[PDB]
Write a protein that binds this ligand. Structure first.
Ligand SMILES: COC1=C(c2cc(Cl)ccc2C#N)CC(=O)N([C@@H](C[C@@H]2CCCCO2)C(=O)Nc2ccc(C(=O)O)cc2)C1
Length: 236
C-alpha cells in the first residue's frame, strides 16, 4: 500500500495473508474471509502454484513477524479459479480457496459481506484498500498491515487512462487524480472494502495497475458484484 497508515489488531478481520511454503515460506497474496471455509482472492496469485499443498492461509495477522513455527494456519483443500481467467489485465481475476477446516469467528477473524442484492446502484464513498504490499514500486513486503482510503473512479474515466487495455464492467477502478495512495506489489488478492450504512462490503479484489500511485493511473480491481452468482454457485 502506497501512502497508507498502519492498521491495528481487529481493524480488518476479513483480511488474510496467503503464504507459499516452497521454496521458502513467504507472503504471496492477500485474501478475504467470505464464509466459514472460504477465502476470496485473485486468480493471478496461483501462477506457477503446482497444487494447494504448498499454500497456507493465516488469519488474525497484523504483523507478518507474528508468523512463527507455532502460529496456527488453515490448509487449503481446493483452489477454484474462474474458468475464463487468462491474465489479470484481461479480467476474470477471481478465485476461491476452500479451507481444510472452518474458521471460528473472533474479533480478529470474521467474514465480510458481498455487495448486497438491491445495492447494484449504490455510490460507495468510503472505500479502503489494505495489505502488506510495497510502499512504492521498488520496495519489499511490509511487516504491519497497511490501509489507505481510495476514491472509486468511473469505468469511463478508468478506460481513458488505460487505452491499451479493455476496462470492462467486470472491473472497478480506484485512485486519486494526482496519485499518492494506491495498492502496490504484494497487495493483490486482498480486499477493496467499502462501508455503506455502517456495514462493510467486499466491493473489489486488488488485481493490477501499470505502476503504483501514479497520477491519473487508478488501480484496477475485480468488480465483486459482477461475480456474486459465480461465488454463490461455487460456495453451495
Ligand atoms: C501488476 O499489478 C500488481 C498489483 C497492483 C494492483 C493495483 Cl490495484 C495497483 C497497482 C499494482 C501494482 N504494481 C498488485 C500486486 O500485488 N501484484 C502482484 C502480481 C503477482 C503475480 C504473481 C503472483 C503474485 O502476484 C505482485 O506484484 N505481487 C508480489 C510482488 C512481490 C512480492 C515480494 O517481493 O515478495 C510479493 C508479491 C501486481
Amino acid at each position: 500500500i502506497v501512502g497508507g497508515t498502519a492498521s491495528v489488531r481487529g481493524e480488518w478481520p476479513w483480511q488474510v495473508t496467503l503464504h507459499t511454503t516452497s521454496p521458502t515460506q513467504r507472503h504471496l497474496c492477500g485474501g478475504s474471509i467470505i464464509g466459514n471455509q472460504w477465502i476470496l482472492t485473485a486468480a493471478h496469485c496461483f501462477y506457477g502454484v503446482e497444487s494447494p499443498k504448498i499454500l497456507r492461509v493465516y488469519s488474525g495477522i497484523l504483523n507478518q513477524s507474528e508468523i512463527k513455527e507455532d502460529t496456527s494456519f488453515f490448509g487449503v483443500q481446493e483452489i477454484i479459479i474462474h474458468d475464463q481467467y487468462k491474465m489479470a489485465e484481461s479480467g476474470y481475476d477471481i478465485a476461491l480457496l476452500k479451507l481444510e477446516t472452518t474458521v471460528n469467528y473472533t474479533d480478529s477473524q470474521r467474514p465480510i459481506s458481498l455487495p448486497s442484492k438491491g445495492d447494484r446502484n449504490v455510490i460507495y464513498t468510503d472505500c479502503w484498500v489494505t495489505g502488506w504490499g510495497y510502499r512504492k514500486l521498488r520496495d519489499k513486503i511490509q511487516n504491519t498491515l497497511q490501509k489507505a482510503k481510495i476514491p472509486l473512479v468511473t469505468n469511463e474515466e478508468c478506460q481513458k487512462r488505460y487505452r491499451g487495455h479493455k476496462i470492462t464492467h467486470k472491473m472497478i477502478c480506484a485512485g486519486y487524480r494526482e496519485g499518492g495512495k494506491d495498492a502496490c506489489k504484494g497487495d493483490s488478492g486482498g480486499p477493496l472494502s467499502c462501508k455503506h450504512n455502517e456495514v462493510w462490503h467486499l466491493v473489489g479484489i486488488t488485481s493490477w495497475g501499470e505502476g503504483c500511485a501514479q497520477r491519473e493511473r487508478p488501480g484496477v480491481y475485480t468488480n465483486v458484484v459482477e461475480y456474486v452468482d459465480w461465488i454463490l454457485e461455487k460456495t453451495q
